[PDB]
Design a protein around this ligand. Structure first.
Ligand code: CDL
Ligand code: CDL
Ligand code: CDL
Ligand code: CDL
Ligand code: PC7
Ligand code: PC7
Ligand code: PC7
Ligand code: PTY
Lengths: 375, 61, 82, 80, 145, 104, 111, 47, 205
């Protein structure tokens, strides 16, 4: 019964915080900082390893910039779903966790839209829903065939590999991100383009979900780079950068380089924090430099990990493609710098809520030299 | 017309300047929680409808 | 006044060419739905494909890139006609 | 591990304070309390990161020795 | 045996009727009949509680939500009939292509016990039921706002 | 010669046809969103029935559990999606004509 | 074959999660209760509990005062964190009694 | 200023760093599923 | 060297050789050997057989490209309006012509490659360059002036890239290990492994 207590404490924590927030709901505290701190404390009871501590760190940094009890509660729900995705041992765990996370995404997207933004945000949420239904239905049908044929539910199969390709957002499965994250709140796009990936990477590494095929990561890299270079809108540029990088990280993870992808996801979270929560041009400039992989900042270390892992596996086509696609993506990042300082006078909203933005920029500048051992 | 327009202008400026400090600070908080309450998906908005001039609960929703 | 690039073509003819892009726009979910479905089934079938030489794979990629038509190209040139 | 971690951390705390002032439009000397706090926390954090790195270095050494990597006493000295 | 075959065969016609009809209200009726036929299929496999669950959750509750939405969003979809012969046979050919030559296994009969099912749901697989309850709570909180 | 083998093949054919009709039916026959979600429910029911069938075949409880999980998750997804559909239809502008039928 | 008889009232059941490990250390108690585990919590662990309680009281007051509810937030946060850390310590002490974790002090103190 | 000592100390530092890196590059899979490759690792599963 | 007086780098004696020493005591391989199907498809002995084995890739790619274009057309046609013309009569030529022309280009490429290798008798870069040149020439039969030059060059360059990074690159760096002692330098005192690291199992997807 003692082993069950570890999981049960997290429930009891979440429930009592929920009922306390429901009772203590007032206009005097619309920004419920106290429940945010309570949620952060409660999520410490789920840390058991380094990857779980990274999950906690990103979850807390995300919950800081959500406003209200309700959105923070659904971020806690996303954290629970992610924690169970890491611990899933067969098909049922994978399914339960990931469509719980999909439900949390739908709710978070719906509740952060204004009345004037409903026409496009609800359309994007609906399109995401239907595509996710396609993915889940195919997954569970093939899972039924596999469970019939083998008599057991084993998470080392092609079915879960393709389902996790959909979850990662690689090669033919990246369009839901483009449609949904273009029309949703910037924080929602930021937290759901970084945090979900860590659980999928952990599941792939631990449960041996790797394929010999390199087509999908190659397609992700080339398509992401070329579409980023051809995209006029800034949101599409940032969204396609993730497709390219996650294709490259998928190629690295299949070969067993778990440590490097676990560092890359964290450095990418920190790098994307500043450009998505754009309040200052200089912070966004450093963030864009970090995403490009540029040397003075921590983003150079994260990209260097992946590239260094590539030369070890000694696949020439991947390296050649990596160089050319990296140049193509660099052109789009340079477009982003040009738009801020070299096109026209720029005036932005004075949204002085840089909770972890200054800390993230400081970490990007500073952290390069301490982490140099990694590469 | 200039004379009359500046009469109305003077009435407005006199109204703004003549408020006491405690009222000014209270009005600053009114503006602030007006900005915080702009999001209509907040849990409290489901609870109540707030008076526009002073963001106090006027009637339940 | 400054030296400027010569723009080929007449102003109204170029504007008429550009106005052929103003056509009823389908929503992208219809393309995305089919691509997702056939892509899932395609990834399932790929694991059963025979191993091809790298040279043939690269030539197939080149042919596919050359044969790919941008969605805007069909948009401008589409005619609801036999 | 690194023998210059604490000095680096103090300098980087200065980096935090001055950068935060500059981004907000203030001068580098403004909000003096932020400087002391940033320096102290950054120094402590840099130290702690160094011990964490050393500890996982040693854990990896134990694992590889169990697996069969014939590390010598000098190689065992490389990992503090 | 003839009854089992008739139900297994009727499921495909009741699925085809849903997509073919142009009225959203009629498709819901066909789906309700499909759900009842799915209950009836589950009876041949030896499940009573599970087949009850399909009827209670889907026919009893989900269809009511669907029809509530359908009346609210009522739209004129009697625009035209596009069910040309050429389209319907193309759909049937696609269906035949997808559903052919797959691995088939002998029809089982397995008696279930809700005693064993309850014991496992609340002792050994208790992690599953609480996460399903959390998912229901997520749906409740999200839909009500 | 064996009724069970014949019934097994018929069941496989039928369940696969139901799945493919659910997933591709509403998009092939261009329909509104409400029909798309109903066909998605049909496909999920097909998969859950396959899992119950496998449970009967192997005398195992895993498929029973996965099927109740499918029922719960599908119902929650449909509720949220119907919420989004109703909200989408309430924000339609007068000029918009078939808002629900994006597949047109 | 024949159905095995089932006794409805005694049907074999087990908790959901299991620790797959044979006890390395001596087993003081095979199945400790909650109170047995709490009685075996070390003094240092209790001091850690008290320190967390005080720190979370101060932090809860600080955060709640920004929302004009300092006292209630402070008490709720204190109770929350104290409960969580006390359960963590009780789980560790129960593992020590079961022999999974080091138990030399425990075996000396309660023979 | 003993240039010989400085040169040899610097070279020794670099050579030690290389040895440490090559030890650090010796990595088997840490996957929880992979009990064969890690058979000797001391682990407990709570599942 | 880092000095202006004597040449940089070094030289190795050609007379002196160093006995090979194993990177580890016991070698465990997670890289699977080529399948018999791969060797069958790679076999260029019979040019007709080689062509017929490798064309399904080209036909597949042409079919996807034609399906993409045909769906772009189909998506646009209005369902609400009844159309006098037959849509499939419009759409089938697209897919069929794309697939046929792709298959023809791939057939020229594979046939010329196998024929050149048989006649030359050696596996070389030149076979791929000549097959690509012929394929690009067929691509630009009636095309305007830059294209007679550019397509033979691009189609010839593609097999060069495939050979350089698909065959030469892997074979050049087989020996390099990354663990234990550097492949050239075993005299140096580095930790020597009993077994090579297995970062992943042999794949099976
Ligand atoms: C202070 C001492 C710390 C030193 C050692 C730490 C261990 C002791 C933990 C003590 C706690 C200190 C926390 C520090 C680390 C946290 C780890 C941890 O906690 O668990 C690990 C620890 C044992 O796991 P392990 O040591 O990792 O070994 C297991 C295996 O080796 C499997 O694990 P593995 O993954 O490590 O396997 C080895 C791995 C080797 O992996 C490594 O080498 C690790 C490298 C170090 C990375 C450090 C960064 C990680 C970021 C996380 C930040 C920590 C957040 C703290 C969260 C917990 C707070 C307590 O090899 C791999 O290939 C796997 C890949 C690993 C990931 C790749 C690393 C990249 C990280 C990302 C870096 C990217 C840069 C970002 C920017 C940085 C720029 C400077 O578990 C515990 O000891 C118990 C955890 C209990 C936590 C909380 C429970 C107490 C409170 C309960 C009640 C709570 C409610 C009341 C609240 C009260 C307050 C109000
Ligand atoms: C009924 C449903 C209809 C679909 C039917 C098929 C259904 C799918 C079934 C299975 C799907 C999985 C496999 C399909 C391919 C994966 C792509 C995908 O699914 O992403 C979702 C994609 C939609 O995603 P999206 O985000 O909405 O669209 C992003 C674009 O911005 C879209 O916006 P955009 O169209 O307006 O802009 C297009 C843009 C987008 O950019 C791309 O297309 C990137 C493609 C680059 C190559 C991709 C990686 C290739 C690696 C292949 C790996 C296998 C071989 C391994 C070895 C190869 C080594 C390289 O590219 C262009 O601007 C046009 C040029 C296209 C190629 C550019 C490279 C040219 C190089 C040639 C140089 C020669 C010129 C020399 C002379 C120059 C004079 C100065 O759906 C599709 O496009 C599927 C259509 C299937 C047709 C593909 C035909 C051949 C496929 C195999 C050949 C591989 C080459 C790729 C060709 C282009 C493919 C896009
Ligand atoms: C590097 C490689 C990388 C590897 C890993 C890296 C590691 C990663 C993690 C590392 C992270 C580092 C980067 C992040 C840094 C953290 C951010 C940060 O800097 O603070 C942000 C935060 C931003 O402040 P803000 O911009 O004004 O915005 C907040 C608003 O006011 C909002 O207003 P509010 O309503 O929220 O007000 C709440 C708050 C915010 O309120 C304020 O901040 C207003 C200012 C606080 C009062 C002024 C502080 C008085 C002492 C300051 C000493 C400055 C000396 C300079 C001039 C010399 C004067 C002789 O009030 C507090 O200060 C709470 C703390 C309570 C302490 C108050 C002072 C107690 C009396 C003094 C105690 C001891 C006195 C001994 C000597 C005193 C004379 C030297 O700064 C603080 O909150 C300051 C908290 C602490 C105050 C300083 C106390 C230091 C103790 C005196 C020095 C004694 C020596 C120190 C050692 C011994 C310690 C006892
Ligand atoms: C303990 C006792 C104390 C003793 C002191 C010891 C303390 C140690 C150091 C502490 C000193 C404080 C550090 C300065 C903090 C603020 C710096 C700043 O804001 O920059 C401009 C600032 C002056 O700008 P501003 O006129 O006041 O207006 C700025 C407005 O906010 C925005 O104006 P805007 O909107 O018009 O933007 C126009 C922008 C045009 O737009 C752009 O060009 C953007 C381009 C993206 C970044 C540039 C990429 C290339 C940067 C290369 C790095 C330069 C060093 C190269 C050496 C190679 C290193 C590998 O042009 C510029 O901003 C200046 C261009 C050149 C500056 C670029 C270098 C800045 C790097 C990042 C700064 C650190 C921020 C940390 C954040 C802290 C938390 C928020 O500082 C300078 O006067 C020159 C920059 C000084 C560079 C030192 C910073 C260290 C970075 C090196 C990285 C090495 C790792 C870090 C280790 C550091 C030692 C531990
Ligand atoms: C070895 C370290 C390197 C590895 C890095 C990863 C490890 C991270 C370690 C350091 C983490 C530091 C994180 C810094 C976050 C910055 C603090 C912050 O965000 O404060 C917010 C907090 O905002 C909130 O929402 C408050 C609610 C939560 C309050 C904090 C909760 C504390 C919970 C207890 C956590 C204790 C840990 C539990 C036990 C481990 C306040 O900012 P705002 O008021 O929202 O806007 C700022 C406006 N402007 C700057 C422009 C003036
Ligand atoms: C994020 C995770 C999501 C999924 C979580 C799955 C993990 C949780 C699974 C467990 C759910 C809660 C079930 C209770 C957990 C602890 C077990 C327990 O306390 O019950 C005792 C039952 O025994 C007791 O300890 C009685 C005292 C119980 C007091 C209450 C403790 C449990 C409270 C549960 C919380 C529910 C309260 C309402 C929720 C707010 C164990 O049974 P036995 O000891 O074998 O039977 C007793 C016979 N004998 C002692 C002689 C061996
Ligand atoms: C120096 C040790 C003793 C310190 C005395 C405090 C001990 C009291 C028990 C703990 C209570 C909480 C500790 C205070 C921390 C934050 C409280 C706070 O937020 O301060 C103000 C407002 O917030 C601030 O001003 C920021 C203060 C930040 C902390 C500055 C004090 C630093 C020392 C206090 C904590 C030291 C440790 C406490 C004991 C461990 C609260 O505003 P009100 O809710 O209106 O209550 C005031 C009551 N009345 C107006 C009616 C008179
Ligand atoms: C990125 C490299 C791509 C090449 C770019 C060249 C310019 C593109 C123009 C397109 C022309 C088609 C490509 C031809 C390049 C090959 C060079 C020709 C040399 C040559 O014919 O010798 C062959 C070997 O060289 C070879 O085929 C292998 C040589 C590798 C090419 C050179 C690599 C470095 C070039 C980088 C320049 C700067 C990069 C910017 C593009 C024959 O050899 P054999 O074995 O068949 O003997 C014959 C027994 N029958």
């Amino acid at each position: 019964m003692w082993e069950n207590l570890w999981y049960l404490d997290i429930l009891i924590n979440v429930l009592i915080i929920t009922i306390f927030g429901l009772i203590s709901c007032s206009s005097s505290a619309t920004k419920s900082y106290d429940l945010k701190g309570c949620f952060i404390i409660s999520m410490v009871g789920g840390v058991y390893d380094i990857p779980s501590a990274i999950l906690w760190c990103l979850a807390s940094l995300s919950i800081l910039n959500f406003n209200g009890f309700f959105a923070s509660l659904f971020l806690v729900f996303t954290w629970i779903s992610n924690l169970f995705a890491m611990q899933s041992l067969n098909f049922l765990g994978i399914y339960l966790a990931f469509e719980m996370q999909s439900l949390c995404l739908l709710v978070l997207g719906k509740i952060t839209a204004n009345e004037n933004q409903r026409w496009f945000a609800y359309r994007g949420l609906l399109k995401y829903l239907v595509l996710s239904l396609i993915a889940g239905s195919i997954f569970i049908f093939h899972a039924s065939s596999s469970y019939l044929q083998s008599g057991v539910m084993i998470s080392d199969s092609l079915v879960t590999y393709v389902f996790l390709l959909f979850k990662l957002g690689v090669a033919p499965f990246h369009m839901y991100t483009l449609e949904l994250f273009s029309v949703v709140s910037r924080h929602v796009a930021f937290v759901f383009s970084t945090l979900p990936k860590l659980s999928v990477l952990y599941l792939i590494s631990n449960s041996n979900i790797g394929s010999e095929c390199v087509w999908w990561g190659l397609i992700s890299l080339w398509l992401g780079s070329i579409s980023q270079y051809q995209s006029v809108f800034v949101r599409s540029i940032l969204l396609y950068s993730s497709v390219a990088e996650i294709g490259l990280v998928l190629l690295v993870l299949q070969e067993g380089f778990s440590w490097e992808a676990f560092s890359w996801v964290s450095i990418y979270f920190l790098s994307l924090s500043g450009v998505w929560h754009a309040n200052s041009k200089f912070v966004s400039a450093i963030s864009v430099a970090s995403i490009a992989g540029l040397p003075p900042f921590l983003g150079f270390i994260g990209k260097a990990q992946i590239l260094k892992s590539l030369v070890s596996i000694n696949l020439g086509i991947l390296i050649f493609s990596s160089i050319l696609a990296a140049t193509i993506s660099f052109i789009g990042y340079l477009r982003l710098i040009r738009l801020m300082y070299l096109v026209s006078p720029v005036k932005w909203k004075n949204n002085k809520d840089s909770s972890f933005i200054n800390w993230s920029t400081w970490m990007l500048t500073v952290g390069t030299l301490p982490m140099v051992y990694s590469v | 017309s200039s004379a009359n327009n500046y009469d109305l202008l003077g009435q407005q400026h006199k109204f703004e300047n003549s408020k006491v400090f405690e009222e000014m600070l209270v009005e600053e908080e009114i503006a602030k929680d007006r900005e915080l309450l702009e999001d209509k998906n907040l849990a409290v908005h489901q609870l109540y409808i707030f008076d526009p001039q002073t963001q106090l609960a006027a009637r339940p929703r | 006044d400054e030296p400027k690039h010569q723009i080929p073509g007449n102003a109204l003819d170029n504007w008429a060419f550009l106005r052929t892009y103003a056509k009823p726009l389908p929503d992208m979910i219809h393309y995305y739905y089919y691509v997702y479905l056939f892509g899932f089934f395609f990834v399932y079938k790929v694991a059963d494909f025979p191993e091809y030489s790298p040279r043939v794979l690269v030539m197939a990629a080149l042919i596919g890139s050359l044969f790919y038509v941008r969605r805007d190209w069909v948009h401008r040139e589409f005619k609801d006609s036999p | 591990g690194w023998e210059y971690a604490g000095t680096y951390g103090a300098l980087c705390g200065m980096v935090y304070a001055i950068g935060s002032n500059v981004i907000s439009g203030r001068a580098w000397f403004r909000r003096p309390w932020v400087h002391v706090t940033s320096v102290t926390l950054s120094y402590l954090g840099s130290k702690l990161l160094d011990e964490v790195q050393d500890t996982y270095y040693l854990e990896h050494l134990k694992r590889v020795e169990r697996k069969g990597l014939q590390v010598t006493e000098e190689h065992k000295k490389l990992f503090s | 045996m003839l009854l089992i075959y008739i139900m297994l065969s009727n499921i495909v016609v009741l699925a085809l009727s849903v997509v073919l009809t142009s009225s959203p209200f009629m498709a819901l009726m066909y789906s309700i009949l499909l759900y009842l036929n799915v209950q009836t299929i589950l009876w041949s496999l030896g499940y009573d509680f599970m087949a009850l669950i399909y009827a209670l959750v889907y026919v009893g509750a989900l269809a009511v939500l669907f029809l509530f939405v359908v009346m609210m969003v009522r739209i004129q979809v009697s625009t035209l009939s596009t069910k040309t012969i050429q389209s319907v046979l193309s759909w049937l050919a696609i269906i035949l292509i997808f559903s052919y030559g797959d691995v088939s296994f002998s029809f089982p009969c397995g008696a279930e016990s809700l005693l064993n099912f309850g014991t496992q749901l609340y002792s050994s697989c208790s992690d599953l039921t609480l996460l399903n309850s959390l998912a229901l709570t997520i749906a409740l909180f999200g839909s009500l706002v | 010669h064996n009724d069970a083998e014949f019934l097994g093949a018929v069941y496989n054919f039928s369940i696969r046809s139901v799945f493919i009709t659910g997933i591709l039916g509403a998009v092939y026959w261009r329909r509104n969103l409400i029909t798309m979600l109903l066909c998605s429910e049909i496909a999920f029911i097909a998969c859950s029935v396959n899992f119950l069938y496998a449970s009967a075949y192997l005398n195992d409880m895993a498929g029973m559990l996965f099927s109740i999980t499918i029922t719960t998750i599908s119902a929650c997804e449909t509720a949220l999606g119907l919420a989004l559909c109703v909200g989408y239809f309430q924000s339609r502008a007068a000029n918009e004509v078939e808002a629900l039928n994006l597949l047109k | 074959t024949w159905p095995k008889p089932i006794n409805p009232y005694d049907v074999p059941s087990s908790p959901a999660y299991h620790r797959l490990q044979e006890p390395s250390y001596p087993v003081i108690d095979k199945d400790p209760d909650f109170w047995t585990a709490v009685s075996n919590v070390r003094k240092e662990e209790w001091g850690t509990t008290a320190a967390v309680a005080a720190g979370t009281f101060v932090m809860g007051y600080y955060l709640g005062a920004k929302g004009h509810t300092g006292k209630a937030s402070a008490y709720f946060t204190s109770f929350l964190a104290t409960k969580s850390i006390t359960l963590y310590h009780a789980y560790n002490s129960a593992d020590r009694l079961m022999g999974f974790k080091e138990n030399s002090r425990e075996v000396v103190k309660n023979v | 200023v003993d240039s010989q000592a400085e040169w040899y100390a610097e070279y020794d530092k670099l050579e030690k760093a290389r040895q440490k890196r090559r030890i650090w590059k010796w990595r088997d899979s840490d996957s929880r599923d992979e009990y064969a490759i890690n058979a000797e690792e001391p682990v407990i599963y709570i599942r | 060297t880092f000095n202006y007086v004597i040449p940089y780098g070094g030289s190795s004696s050609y007379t002196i050789n160093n006995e090979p020493v194993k990177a580890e005591e016991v070698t465990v391989d997670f890289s699977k050997e080529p399948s018999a199907s791969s060797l069958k498809l790679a076999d260029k002995s019979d040019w007709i057989a080689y062509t017929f084995n490798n064309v399904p890739l080209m036909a597949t790619v042409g079919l996807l490209a034609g399906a993409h274009e045909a769906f772009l057309h189909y998506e646009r046609t209005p369902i609400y309006g009844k159309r006098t013309y037959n849509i499939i009569k419009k759409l089938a030529p697209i897919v069929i012509n794309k697939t046929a022309y792709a298959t023809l280009l791939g057939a020229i490429f594979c046939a010329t490659d196998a024929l050149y290798e048989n006649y030359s008798g050696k596996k070389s870069y030149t076979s791929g360059m000549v097959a690509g040149a012929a394929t690009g020439a067929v691509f630009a039969i009636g095309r305007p002036l830059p294209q007679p030059l550019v397509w033979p060059l691009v189609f010839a360059a593609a097999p060069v890239i495939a050979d350089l990074f698909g065959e030469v690159y892997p074979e050049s760096m087989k020996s390099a290990r990354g663990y234990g002692t550097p492949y050239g330098f075993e005299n140096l005192d580095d930790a020597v492994p009993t077994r090579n690291p297995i970062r992943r199992n042999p794949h099976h997807y």
